[PDB]
Design a protein around this ligand. Structure first.
Ligand code: HEM
Length: 154
């Protein structure tokens, strides 16, 4: 699949709002993932001791990680599909070291969409959500293809 330029601009216009405060958005997205799909937290040896939303919010180390995650995703989105170089290292680490199935990437995609819907109704109406869904679906399809090349079922 391929996004239109208009669809990319809807993606990038909401991401511009995320970048007012990437850390706060990152906290909201990973906490939403862990609340909605608690099995995902067990993949993080670094964070799986955290018991409550309040502990997650208070963790400076989690905050920092969420900034790393969202900045990596933002750099991918800014490539508008031309993200082969960015996807290589991430697909390798997530396949071989972290062992993150495609289903869990669906779950984090849901969390991203939820938080952007909540925080950004001015830039995340139906067309904008559809564009972000397409971008995240493209990202997941390309990761799944790389996982297969790397030997991971996903
Ligand atoms: C939008 C999707 C995601 C992006 C962009 C992303 C990005 C990153 C980045 C940049 C790192 C650090 C470098 C590396 O190890 O490759 C990382 C680490 C990690 N990711 Fe992801 N990630 C995503 C989704 C997930 C999901 C859904 C899980 C778990 C369910 C996961 C689990 C991990 C783990 C366990 C680490 C190592 C954390 C640590 O101990 O330092 N990732 N991720």
């Amino acid at each position: 699949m391929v996004l239109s330029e208009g669809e990319w601009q809807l993606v990038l216009h909401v991401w511009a709002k995320v970048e007012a405060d990437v850390a706060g958005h990152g906290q909201d997205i990973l906490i939403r993932l862990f609340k909605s799909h608690p099995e995902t937290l067990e993949k993080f040896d670094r964070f799986k001791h955290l018991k409550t939303e309040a502990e997650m919010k208070a963790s400076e180390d989690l905050k920092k990680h969420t900034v790393t995650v969202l900045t990596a995703l933002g750099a991918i989105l800014k490539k508008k599909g031309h993200h082969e170089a960015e996807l290589k290292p991430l697909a390798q680490s997530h396949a071989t070291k972290h062992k993150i199935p495609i289903k869990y990437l669906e779950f984090i995609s849901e969390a991203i969409i939820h938080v952007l819907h909540s925080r950004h109704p001015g830039d995340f109406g139906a067309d904008a959500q559809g564009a972000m869904n397409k971008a995240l679906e493209l990202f997941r399809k390309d990761i799944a293809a790389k996982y297969k090349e790397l030997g991971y079922q996903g």
